Design an enzyme around this catalytic site. Sequence first.
Site, PDB file in Angstrom:
ATOM      1  CD  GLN B 125      42.100  32.956  63.243  1.00 34.60           C
ATOM      2  OE1 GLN B 125      40.951  33.254  62.920  1.00 34.60           O
ATOM      3  NE2 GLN B 125      43.156  33.528  62.688  1.00 34.60           N
ATOM      4  CB  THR B 153      45.970  31.428  61.989  1.00 36.18           C
ATOM      5  OG1 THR B 153      44.937  30.808  62.781  1.00 36.18           O
ATOM      6  CG2 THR B 153      46.159  30.607  60.657  1.00 36.18           C
ATOM      7  NE  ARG B 162      42.412  29.426  49.808  1.00 33.65           N
ATOM      8  CZ  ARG B 162      41.877  30.007  50.890  1.00 33.65           C
ATOM      9  NH1 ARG B 162      40.549  30.275  50.941  1.00 33.65           N
ATOM     10  NH2 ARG B 162      42.647  30.294  51.954  1.00 33.65           N
ATOM     11  CG  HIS B 228      44.619  27.553  56.405  1.00 34.46           C
ATOM     12  ND1 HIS B 228      44.997  28.574  57.252  1.00 34.46           N
ATOM     13  CD2 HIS B 228      43.402  27.910  55.889  1.00 34.46           C
ATOM     14  CE1 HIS B 228      44.043  29.513  57.266  1.00 34.46           C
ATOM     15  NE2 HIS B 228      43.079  29.152  56.429  1.00 34.46           N
ATOM     16  N   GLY B 261      40.928  17.198  57.449  1.00 33.50           N
ATOM     17  CA  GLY B 261      40.398  15.913  57.038  1.00 33.50           C
ATOM     18  C   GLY B 261      39.703  15.066  58.091  1.00 33.50           C
ATOM     19  NE  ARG B 263      36.077  16.107  55.880  1.00 39.14           N
ATOM     20  CZ  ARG B 263      36.859  17.097  56.300  1.00 39.14           C
ATOM     21  NH1 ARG B 263      37.155  17.246  57.606  1.00 39.14           N
ATOM     22  NH2 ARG B 263      37.319  17.956  55.360  1.00 39.14           N
ATOM     23  N   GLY B 282      36.816  21.405  60.880  1.00 37.67           N
ATOM     24  CA  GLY B 282      36.400  22.630  60.178  1.00 37.67           C
ATOM     25  C   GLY B 282      35.186  22.376  59.309  1.00 37.67           C
ATOM     26  NE  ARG B 283      37.214  22.288  53.057  1.00 38.21           N
ATOM     27  CZ  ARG B 283      38.559  22.263  53.218  1.00 38.21           C
ATOM     28  NH1 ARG B 283      39.114  21.450  54.153  1.00 38.21           N
ATOM     29  NH2 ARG B 283      39.330  22.973  52.364  1.00 38.21           N
TER      30      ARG B 283
HETATM   31  C1  LIG Z   1      37.048  25.489  55.444  1.00 38.99           C
HETATM   32  C2  LIG Z   1      37.572  26.771  55.930  1.00 38.99           C
HETATM   33  C3  LIG Z   1      38.746  26.755  56.736  1.00 38.99           C
HETATM   34  C4  LIG Z   1      39.309  27.949  57.238  1.00 38.99           C
HETATM   35  C5  LIG Z   1      38.665  29.177  56.937  1.00 38.99           C
HETATM   36  C6  LIG Z   1      37.507  29.172  56.147  1.00 38.99           C
HETATM   37  C7  LIG Z   1      36.980  27.992  55.632  1.00 38.99           C
HETATM   38  C8  LIG Z   1      35.708  27.988  54.834  1.00 38.99           C
HETATM   39  N1  LIG Z   1      39.233  30.300  57.433  1.00 38.99           N
HETATM   40  C9  LIG Z   1      39.528  31.300  56.428  1.00 38.99           C
HETATM   41  O1  LIG Z   1      39.036  31.387  55.259  1.00 38.99           O
HETATM   42  C10 LIG Z   1      40.586  32.468  56.761  1.00 38.99           C
HETATM   43  C11 LIG Z   1      40.898  33.331  55.659  1.00 38.99           C
HETATM   44  C12 LIG Z   1      42.119  33.147  54.967  1.00 38.99           C
HETATM   45  C13 LIG Z   1      42.440  33.987  53.872  1.00 38.99           C
HETATM   46  C14 LIG Z   1      41.553  35.014  53.508  1.00 38.99           C
HETATM   47  C15 LIG Z   1      40.343  35.215  54.214  1.00 38.99           C
HETATM   48  C16 LIG Z   1      40.022  34.357  55.285  1.00 38.99           C
HETATM   49  C17 LIG Z   1      40.017  30.257  58.548  1.00 38.99           C
HETATM   50  C18 LIG Z   1      40.758  29.074  58.729  1.00 38.99           C
HETATM   51  N2  LIG Z   1      41.681  28.997  59.694  1.00 38.99           N
HETATM   52  C19 LIG Z   1      41.915  29.992  60.546  1.00 38.99           C
HETATM   53  O2  LIG Z   1      42.817  29.925  61.467  1.00 38.99           O
HETATM   54  N3  LIG Z   1      41.116  31.160  60.466  1.00 38.99           N
HETATM   55  C20 LIG Z   1      40.195  31.266  59.461  1.00 38.99           C
HETATM   56  O3  LIG Z   1      39.498  32.320  59.434  1.00 38.99           O
HETATM   57  N4  LIG Z   1      40.463  27.992  58.004  1.00 38.99           N
HETATM   58  C21 LIG Z   1      41.186  26.648  58.290  1.00 38.99           C
HETATM   59  C22 LIG Z   1      40.514  25.781  59.453  1.00 38.99           C
HETATM   60  O4  LIG Z   1      40.758  26.405  60.728  1.00 38.99           O
HETATM   61  C23 LIG Z   1      41.109  24.341  59.523  1.00 38.99           C
HETATM   62  O5  LIG Z   1      42.536  24.456  59.500  1.00 38.99           O
HETATM   63  C24 LIG Z   1      40.671  23.482  58.347  1.00 38.99           C
HETATM   64  O6  LIG Z   1      39.221  23.757  58.112  1.00 38.99           O
HETATM   65  C25 LIG Z   1      40.764  22.048  58.876  1.00 38.99           C
HETATM   66  O7  LIG Z   1      40.461  21.146  57.865  1.00 38.99           O
HETATM   67  P1  LIG Z   1      38.976  20.447  57.734  1.00 38.99           P
HETATM   68  O8  LIG Z   1      38.445  19.951  59.030  1.00 38.99           O
HETATM   69  O9  LIG Z   1      39.279  19.401  56.728  1.00 38.99           O
HETATM   70  O10 LIG Z   1      38.104  21.544  57.147  1.00 38.99           O
HETATM   71 MG   LIG Z   2      40.029  18.393  60.555  1.00 42.27          MG
END
Ligand SMILES: Cc1cc2c(cc1C)N(C(=O)Cc1ccccc1)c1c([nH]c(=O)[nH]c1=O)N2C[C@H](O)[C@H](O)[C@H](O)COP(=O)(O)O
Ligand SMILES: [Mg+2]
Lengths: 332, 332, 332, 332
Positions: B125, B153, B162, B228, B261, B263, B282-283
């Site tokens: 990425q 991205t 945040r 995101h 989302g 899950r 992700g989470r």
């Molecule tokens: C939960 C989480 C998600 C993400 C990140 C960290 C955390 C804890 N990242 C960052 O903090 C990037 C950043 C942005 C701004 C400043 C510093 C770092 C991250 C990211 N997406 C991506 O391209 N590269 C990243 O490096 N994301 C989105 C992730 O890729 C998915 O889009 C969602 O997690 C799907 O949703 P979920 O399944 O419900 O969680």
């Molecule tokens: Mg998801």
Amino acid sequence: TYVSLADLERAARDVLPGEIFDFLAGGSGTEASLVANRTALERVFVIPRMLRDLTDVTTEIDIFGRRAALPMAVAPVAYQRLFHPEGELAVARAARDAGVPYTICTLSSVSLEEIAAVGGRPWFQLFWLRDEKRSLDLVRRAEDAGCEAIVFTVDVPWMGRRLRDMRNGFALPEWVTAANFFAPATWESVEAVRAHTDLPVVLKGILAVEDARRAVDAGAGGIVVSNHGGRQLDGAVPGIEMLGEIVAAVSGGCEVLVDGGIRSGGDVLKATALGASAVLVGRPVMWALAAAGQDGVRQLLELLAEEVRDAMGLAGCESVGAARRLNTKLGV
Amino acid sequence: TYVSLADLERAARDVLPGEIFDFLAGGSGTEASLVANRTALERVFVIPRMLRDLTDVTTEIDIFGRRAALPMAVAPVAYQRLFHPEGELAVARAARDAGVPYTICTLSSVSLEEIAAVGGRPWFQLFWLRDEKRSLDLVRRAEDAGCEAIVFTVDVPWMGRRLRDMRNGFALPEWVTAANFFAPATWESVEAVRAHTDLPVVLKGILAVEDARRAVDAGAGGIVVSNHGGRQLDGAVPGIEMLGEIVAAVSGGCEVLVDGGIRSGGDVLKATALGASAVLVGRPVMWALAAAGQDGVRQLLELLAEEVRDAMGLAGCESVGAARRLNTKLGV
Amino acid sequence: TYVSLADLERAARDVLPGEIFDFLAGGSGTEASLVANRTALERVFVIPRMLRDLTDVTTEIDIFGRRAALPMAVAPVAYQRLFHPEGELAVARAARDAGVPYTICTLSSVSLEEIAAVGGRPWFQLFWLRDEKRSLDLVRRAEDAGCEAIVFTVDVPWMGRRLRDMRNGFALPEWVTAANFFAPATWESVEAVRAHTDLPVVLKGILAVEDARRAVDAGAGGIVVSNHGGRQLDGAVPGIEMLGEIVAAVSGGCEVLVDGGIRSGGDVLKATALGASAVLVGRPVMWALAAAGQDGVRQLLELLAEEVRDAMGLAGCESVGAARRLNTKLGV
Amino acid sequence: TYVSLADLERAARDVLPGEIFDFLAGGSGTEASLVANRTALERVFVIPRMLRDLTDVTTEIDIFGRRAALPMAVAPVAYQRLFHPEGELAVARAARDAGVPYTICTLSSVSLEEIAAVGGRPWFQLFWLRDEKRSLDLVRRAEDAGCEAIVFTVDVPWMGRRLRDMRNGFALPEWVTAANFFAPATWESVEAVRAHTDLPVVLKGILAVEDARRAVDAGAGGIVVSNHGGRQLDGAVPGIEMLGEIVAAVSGGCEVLVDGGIRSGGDVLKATALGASAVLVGRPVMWALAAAGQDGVRQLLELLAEEVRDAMGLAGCESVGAARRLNTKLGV
Ligand SMILES: Cc1cc2c(cc1C)N(C(=O)Cc1ccccc1)c1c([nH]c(=O)[nH]c1=O)N2C[C@H](O)[C@H](O)[C@H](O)COP(=O)(O)O
Ligand SMILES: [Mg+2]
Ligand SMILES: Cc1cc2c(cc1C)N(C(=O)Cc1ccccc1)c1c([nH]c(=O)[nH]c1=O)N2C[C@H](O)[C@H](O)[C@H](O)COP(=O)(O)O
Ligand SMILES: Cc1cc2c(cc1C)N(C(=O)Cc1ccccc1)c1c([nH]c(=O)[nH]c1=O)N2C[C@H](O)[C@H](O)[C@H](O)COP(=O)(O)O
Ligand SMILES: Cc1cc2c(cc1C)N(C(=O)Cc1ccccc1)c1c([nH]c(=O)[nH]c1=O)N2C[C@H](O)[C@H](O)[C@H](O)COP(=O)(O)O
Ligand SMILES: [Mg+2]
Ligand SMILES: [Mg+2]
Ligand SMILES: [Mg+2]
């Protein structure tokens, strides 16, 4: 630090007397329209655009002749000395310094000439008086003092039923007065005002599409799509829900502002995406005034400016015009 | 035993420091988009088919050249040593063993070459850097290390607001760094990347239909329809709500992934039925990592695989292609 | 006295062991479909007709050859000795006495010949067995014992993910067995059954419109529009939400029953108004059995009969056919 | 002071015995229709008009020959001595003094001649009796006593299932009787009534569009679109949800009233804007009677009159006819 406008609401609730907080917070009747203003914004989702040039994101607009730093003005809110001893002067100074228009109220607790002497971009909000001549006299006073636009509020033939105020037995403290010192206004009143001044006349409280069209035909320079913050007709539709239909009907014939429920820069973005030229913000400005006077309002306007810039850029918009071309989707 | 992904969330909340759990869980602003990602999936109901041959139910897909065991990959999540000492290596090992692609982050806390040396199907990425040349250098580093796809991205010209992090005063511990060491990306950046590599370029963070069409025209091999995880524009539509319109607009011109989302395996089925090629998660992956390191992620991927097989077969689908032809109905 | 079916649920929760109450009450996964069965009925409002002759209101129907006292049958529920020592015999005796068909289960805890010897209108519910020949043998056993219809359940290639059961560690007590002693069924299995018996074959678990059409083409005498009480695919649409579209597609080509969530005579009226020939009722029958054995089921069926008569007459319907011609409106 | 009708509900709950408050408040079955009457009004928003002449706002209407002070009448509510010793005489005196029609009940606890002797605008509500001749005799008695209209309630072939009453073991106190002393009524009964009297016949309890059309064809002078306050068929649509379709179908052929859930002057405005000629108000009148007898009802009618005037004028309507031309929008 305040990191959201909700932080300021909590601070104002701590400091103000309960009956004054209720005069500020409350709506008419069951407060159906007060709640619906918030529900309506919460249902709007934006479809952002990606990969556009954001080298020079600007939140400025031109409206009623002049540049404003954000697509926002301070709504007309009567009797601001209820909330802080400096009242309108504190808010107007912070608005001036932030580059935001401030609307001076017919029912201001500091005279309109004193507030206009602060400088900045003052607009003046008119209520029609049973004594007509006093109406056109206020207009001329406002123009002579340097106000730039006449915001004619048309949704108050009388005050709505404010059950919090009734239950609290609320009345103005002895130390708050109408320092510039209702009849139903009609389209004839609008024409009397339009004839009396070369300033743009902005009709505030329009919700019906045909009233927006008639406003353009009547020579209005703008309208504010508004249900008076849910304080007048209980059960009136939120302005945000009529905005898109009104913007389409007006065909660029006047500026179309909206108010009611704006609580963040993201809400400003949603209103822009639905077609608003700008928004008014009422209660949050009074929360900041209550919490910390002029410096509180300054912090509020700085926070809103940052939130609008953040939301615009994350949505791929380098200008407010680009934000107006965004599409939206209603959610649940 | 964990019997649902929600069991892992509860386990991670027990073990992690609150401010790290909030960095992981939180979204931007009022967290409207974070919540809407879940609301949107909960409104989708599947119309299952009956009486079809299920002798050989398979959850495999082919994507970007290669077979994957499930229609899913591990989303890019920065700084995974925040959640467990082995960080990215624990997750990448479990993903490899489960046959799931793992997305290596520009902001990984272990270098991309070390994670790629784990093996498996690594994607990389990219964030665009103000220093351009560092951008194309990361791309070439990723390709040289064996990454199979470049996930660009495009929804982070800067980090969103945040409020949990602000209120917690959150910052990276001294022991977590960007081991590979924002500018707004534009379509010109995409073309620079597409020219620099023969790997498929996947644009992540697309929500507008016309941006999906432009991505195909730009030579993207895929898009990830995504807000995101509700962490960037607060009030951005959920990807799941745009997915069907985007899949129709693309006409098979690129792979169309979705995230936000997911899950359960039933959520994977819903995304497939709306037309997704695959999902990112992700989470939940970070919950499993926090709870039990590599073995936790292994258990999560085993549970998701069983849930996807269960949902596919109960819906009458012997293949992911059949699941894409299922119809859906929105509920309340 | 019980004055509603909810009174019986409360009584059964008092008497049964928690893990048995959870086997009965629970659904698969997040129980999205279990909840949606109830939500869907609660959204349906009936538009009643007035001023029609109600001299002889009758709730009887003719179905699969024979008269039934109400447009309802007892759904197939496995292992009824879990709920009361007399198990299936108590329920089948009460159903016989009320003039309601009773569906004997493949997984009954009393043999199908003993239950059929109770008399009344027994139907038999088939699961397809990996050993085919055992399948057609059960069918012939049922026909030889006097069952009137073969209800072929087609939505269980395997049991869904019952998280309550997993968390409780639930298993059959030693004293409950499959007294008549999954493979995926296909359309070929349906044809094998249709060829083996002259009884009407009723396919239970159909939700897709094209599967309903195919069922008619396959020679089915009926279908049950059903998501298995939310116990199989989590996220499957409620049958009530597909019923109207299916009734239209079938064009009278077979009987169209529905189940899931029926908790009153008013719910029976809503299902009829949406076009159902009859409903099945599952959990409430087991609540009555748990609460008070055969007499409990008798009281339940008397209460349902009174509620159906009440609702029909208040809606202006002297017959179930008239109720099918009622119109409905969805609410919130 | 009471400032809303909800204040009166709270006062009546304090004073009345619980089982009498439940007879008054309750609905049939699950009380789905009782709740939906309120939900339906809460979803309606009005689009107000501005800048119209409000010199002489009048809430008067002409209906069934005569002027009424508001677009409202007191609904027929049986056995008003349950709520206060003066019963119907207290309510009829307050209605007379407020210029509001009062509907005398077939099941009144004071004889219809005594209530009619109060004066004012009495209407008479008929239930059809198994002894027909007693029916036409009540009609002639009502006409001889000066009643102006016959409100024929057609939605009670029998009483619905009032679970509160069943659970409370509710019965009439010895001191409350039917002082004028069910069979299903049919269209033939309507014709018998229409032939027996020259007074307008108003059919109360119509919800289907074709029944409204048939009522006009049958010579009715009005209909009341009503689900009997949610007390008859549980799951019957709210009248407010059918009103607009019925008003369109009737094409001015009879007066179209509505009832169910009116709790403010704003609700009266919403009903008018959806096309009602007038509303009936049931439970709030009994709350005021319970709270404070005749003076309570007087205060209620004064409060409703002020709320209707307030809502009309804030919506730009100088007459009830103008309010009927308002547009509405459904919200969430
Ligand atoms: C939960 C989480 C998600 C993400 C990140 C960290 C955390 C804890 N990242 C960052 O903090 C990037 C950043 C942005 C701004 C400043 C510093 C770092 C991250 C990211 N997406 C991506 O391209 N590269 C990243 O490096 N994301 C989105 C992730 O890729 C998915 O889009 C969602 O997690 C799907 O949703 P979920 O399944 O419900 O969680
Ligand atoms: Mg998801
Ligand atoms: C919260 C508040 C709002 C307003 C007022 C005072 C308060 C505390 N004013 C009055 O009491 C006028 C009055 C009316 C009747 C009797 C005496 C005085 C006021 C006004 N609008 C206007 O033209 N002139 C005004 O003098 N409003 C509406 C305001 O301009 C905006 O329409 C909403 O505030 C946007 O909604 P918000 O951003 O969610 O708050
Ligand atoms: C509440 C319940 C319902 C059912 C069952 C048991 C229980 C306690 N059975 C099984 O465990 C079968 C099995 C499946 C997998 C492994 C072992 C056994 C059962 C069944 N349907 C059917 O064909 N045959 C069955 O043998 N069902 C659905 C029932 O027929 C109705 O579809 C719903 O009950 C209407 O929904 P309700 O009115 O809201 O309850
Ligand atoms: C709240 C109440 C309402 C009604 C009644 C009594 C009570 C306490 N009556 C009966 O018990 C009649 C009966 C029926 C069956 C067995 C014995 C007596 C009554 C009636 N409508 C009518 O024609 N005649 C009646 O004699 N109703 C409906 C009323 O006329 C309105 O339709 C709703 O009250 C508008 O809804 P509301 O404004 O939200 O309350
Ligand atoms: Mg606002
Ligand atoms: Mg059922
Ligand atoms: Mg009413």
